[PDB]
Amino acid sequence: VGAXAXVXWXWXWXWX
Amino acid sequence: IGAXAXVXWXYXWXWX
Question: What count of other Cβ atoms lies within 10 Å of the Cβ of residue A2?
Fold first, then answer.
């Protein structure tokens, strides 16, 4: 269903 | 900034 594998791109929210 | 590395969990929006 849909496209890809999960929701988003990476992990969490931001960098650090 | 924020937390983690990217946004959400995984790649895209769905599963396939």
Answer: 11
